[PDB]
Amino acid sequence: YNLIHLDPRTREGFTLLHLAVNSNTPVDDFHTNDVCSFPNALVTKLLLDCGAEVNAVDNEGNSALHIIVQYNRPISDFLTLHSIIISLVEAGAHTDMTNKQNKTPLDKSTTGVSEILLKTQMKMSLKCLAARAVRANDINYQDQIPRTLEEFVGFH
Amino acid sequence: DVFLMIRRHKTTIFTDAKESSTVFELKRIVEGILKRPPDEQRLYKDDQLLDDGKTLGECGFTSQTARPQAPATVGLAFRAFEALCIEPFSSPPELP
Amino acid sequence: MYVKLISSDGHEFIVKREHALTSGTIKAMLSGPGQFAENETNEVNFREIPSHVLSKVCMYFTYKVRYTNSSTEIPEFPIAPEIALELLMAANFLDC
Amino acid sequence: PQEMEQTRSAVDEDRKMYLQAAIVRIMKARKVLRHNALIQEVISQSRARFNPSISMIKKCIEVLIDKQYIERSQASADEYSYV
Amino acid sequence: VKKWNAVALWAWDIVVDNCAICRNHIMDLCIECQANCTVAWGVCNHAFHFHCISRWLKTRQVCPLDNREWEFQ
Ligand SMILES: [Zn+2]
Ligand SMILES: [Zn+2]
Ligand SMILES: [Zn+2]
Numbered sequence: 001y002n003l004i005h006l007d008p009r010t011r012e013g014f015t016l017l018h019l020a021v022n023s024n025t026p027v028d029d030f031h032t033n034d035v036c037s038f039p040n041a042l043v044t045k046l047l048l049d050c051g052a053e054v055n056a057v058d059n060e061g062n063s064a065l066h067i068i069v070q071y072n073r074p075i076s077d078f079l080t081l082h083s084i085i086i087s088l089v090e091a092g093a094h095t096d097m098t099n100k101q102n103k104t105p106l107d108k109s110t111t112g113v114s115e116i117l118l119k120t121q122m123k124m125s126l127k128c129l130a131a132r133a134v135r136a137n138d139i140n141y142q143d144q145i146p147r148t149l150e151e152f153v154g155f156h
Numbered sequence: 157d158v159f160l161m162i163r164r165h166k167t168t169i170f171t172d173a174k175e176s177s178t179v180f181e182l183k184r185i186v187e188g189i190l191k192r193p194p195d196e197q198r199l200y201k202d203d204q205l206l207d208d209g210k211t212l213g214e215c216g217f218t219s220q221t222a223r224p225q226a227p228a229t230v231g232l233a234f235r236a237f238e239a240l241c242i243e244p245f246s247s248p249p250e251l252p
Numbered sequence: 253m254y255v256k257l258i259s260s261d262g263h264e265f266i267v268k269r270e271h272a273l274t275s276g277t278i279k280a281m282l283s284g285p286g287q288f289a290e291n292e293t294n295e296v297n298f299r300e301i302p303s304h305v306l307s308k309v310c311m312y313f314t315y316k317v318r319y320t321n322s323s324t325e326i327p328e329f330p331i332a333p334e335i336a337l338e339l340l341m342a343a344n345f346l347d348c
Numbered sequence: 349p350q351e352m353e354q355t356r357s358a359v360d361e362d363r364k365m366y367l368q369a370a371i372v373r374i375m376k377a378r379k380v381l382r383h384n385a386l387i388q389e390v391i392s393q394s395r396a397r398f399n400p401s402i403s404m405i406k407k408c409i410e411v412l413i414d415k416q417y418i419e420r421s422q423a424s425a426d427e428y429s430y431v
Numbered sequence: 432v433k434k435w436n437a438v439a440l441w442a443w444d445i446v447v448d449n450c451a452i453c454r455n456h457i458m459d460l461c462i463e464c465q466a467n468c469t470v471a472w473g474v475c476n477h478a479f480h481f482h483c484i485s486r487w488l489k490t491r492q493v494c495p496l497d498n499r500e501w502e503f504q
Contacts, residue, residue: 075445075457075470075478082443113445119324120444126312126329126348130340133331140252141337149344159314161307168307169254169266170314189254189266189292224314225329245304246261248334365454373466415452416490417463 001050013059017052020044021084022067039068041083054091057155061099062108064088065118069105074113082117089121096128097155102135131156158212158219161227162186162199163242164234170227175213182212192234200231203240255282256295257310263303269294271313276347305342308335312348363398367408368417370394375418376430383409383426446476451495452483474502 008016019025020043027033044064048054057063065088074081089095095118098104109115131153134141141153160182162169169189173182183197199206201216222228231240255272257265273279281296288294298306312329319326331339367390374389375381381389390405409428412418421427442448449455453462457470461480471484477494479487487495494501 073469076468078443078445078458116324116444119326124316124319124326125343126309126316126346127340127343129312129329129331130336130343133333133336134340137333137336139333139337144337145341146344149340152344153340157318159318161311166262167264167266168310170268170271170310172314172318191292223327224318225311225327227311227314243263245263245307246302248302248304248332248338251334251337369453369462369465372462376466416486 004047004050004052007053007056009058013057015053015056015058015064017044017047017054017056017064018058018062018067020047021064021088023071023073039071039080039084041080041087044084045087048087048091052091054088054093055097057099061101061155063093063097063099063105063155065093065095065097065105066099066103066108069109069111069114069118071111071114074111078113081114085114085117085121089123094128094155095122096132098135127152128156158217158222159224159227160212160217160222160230162230162232164232165241166243169232172224173212175219176211177213179206179208179210179212179215183208186232196234196237198233198235198237200233200240201228203231254292254294256293257306258295258297259301259303259306260299261303263306264295265306265310267310267313268317271317272310274313274316274348275309277345301342301345302338304335305339308339309342309346309348312343359398363400363404364408366394366397367400367405368412371405371409371412372417375428380421380427380429383428386428447472447478450479450483452479452487455480472504474504475499477501 004016010019014022019038021039023039025038027036027038054064057066065085068081068084068088071081095106096104099108106115106118109118134153135156141150145153158173158175160171160173162171167190169186171182171185179199182199183194186197187194206215217228229242231242233240253269254266255269255278257267257272257278259265269282273282278296282294301309308331315329370390370393371386374393375386386409387402387405391400394400409418413420413428416431419429419431421429443458445457447457450457450461455461457478457480459465461468461482463482463486464480469481470478471481472478473494475494475497477496479495484501488501492500
């Protein structure tokens with residue numbers, strides 16, 4: 001918890017939750033390969049219980065949910081992949097937010113299994129649909145909406 | 157699972173029913189939730205009368221036509237039958 | 253069982269109570285003082301939102317109740333560009 | 349007994365997959381083995397389970413080479429190599 | 432009805448269940464891979480282990496269940 005409250009970030013904006021989610025996180029060639037395998041659902045669940053910023057994005061804009069859907073091994077460790085998508089959504093990660101390239105994690109799922117899991121765990125809301133329609137039609141939303149909703153249009 | 161947006165001047169009622177059913181129970185439920193005599197229900201689809209015994213699936217809307225995302229309007233002018241005076245929704249402002 | 257939603261521009265909308273309790277703000281409005289326990293009207297007066305956005309949020313209520321959990325066949329919500337940026341603030345107010 | 353023999357044959361089926369998985373693991377740890385050397389090693393590695401009959405292992409051997417998981421060498425039938 | 436108790440055989444919602452090469456499930460490892468992987472799907476809704484698919488395409492360009500030319504995803 002003390003380390004999370006500093007919000008540590010790598011070169012490419014990766015928070016401590018993103019690296020525990022990303023499969024590209026390096027593992028040392030020594031005995032750490034036998035234990036520390038990423039993504040790990042226990043690490044993500046412990047970090048979310050300790051108060052990790054689940055909606056935090058990197059420099060590219062990908063959230064914690066944007067990297068877990070990009071996992072290229074959906075069935076080999078499906079027990080890990082299922083137990084981490086549920087944890088992120090239950091923590092409060094948006095299932096509709098977009099990165100700087102304006103890509104939904106459904107669009108960046110690149111996998112039938114991850115898309116199925118996410119769509120099962122999506123909680124549909126009118127605010128997300130309206131914000132997606134606003135962003136799709138490129139409507140001028142500056143100074144016409146509450147300031148607490150400008151960010152909402154920003155990532156949706 | 158047909159979905160209807162019953163209109164009467166300004167009042168609007170959203171109702172769920174089945175494809176193959178009569179409008180008898182539809183008139184009865186709108187009577188129950190409107191607190192009006194049950195003899196003034198004259199349902200109108202696209203400003204025309206319809207039979208009170210014919211199924212509503214053949215009346216002009218179905219599952220592919222009437223949806224929860226976009227229900228079909230059904231005027232419900234009451235006998236004082238009054239003329240159809242369905243007030244349209246307010247137009248959105250002219251976007252730049 | 254049925255609640256009433258009144259827009260700023262005189263329009264009245266009636267939807268099922270379970271359909272309208274999916275938004276937190278309407279649930280808060282129905283709770284507290286002035287429940288008006290007639291079990292048929294429970295009328296809430298929205299003094300700000302226009303009629304078209306209220307119609308769209310009622311359609312959203314029905315749409316979400318129908319598709320709260322289903323198969324992959326989830327049809328998209330038909331949001332017009334003109335009704336957006338006014339339904340977004342409406343959903344913010346309603347906490348939909 | 350109509351369904352008891354099904355569980356007496358399901359164990360026979362799972363015997364074949366466990367025998368085939370045993371030969372792949374044993375041979376590729378050495379990359380080459382004789383016929384008698386592999387047969388004794390298959391039995392010794394499956395003592396905490398069924399006692400495998402000699403006819404079943406050689407039946408799993410001839411299936412395995414046909415599946416191109418292992419290959420019989422060019423010397424004789426008493427020389428097996430991985431592939 | 433008064434009272435009813437049943438049993439449910441819950442399984443994961445993946446459409447494909449087992450690799451029909453090694454007669455093994457897809458959740459665990461293949462026979463080539465156990466001794467010490469990724470899953471390869473097909474255009475004809477045929478999903479197997481990566482090592483099993485590699486060996487099968489090394490044998491012939493025919494899908495393991497039907498006479499169809501194997502393709503990647
Ligand atoms: Zn493998
Ligand atoms: Zn396999
Ligand atoms: Zn195939």
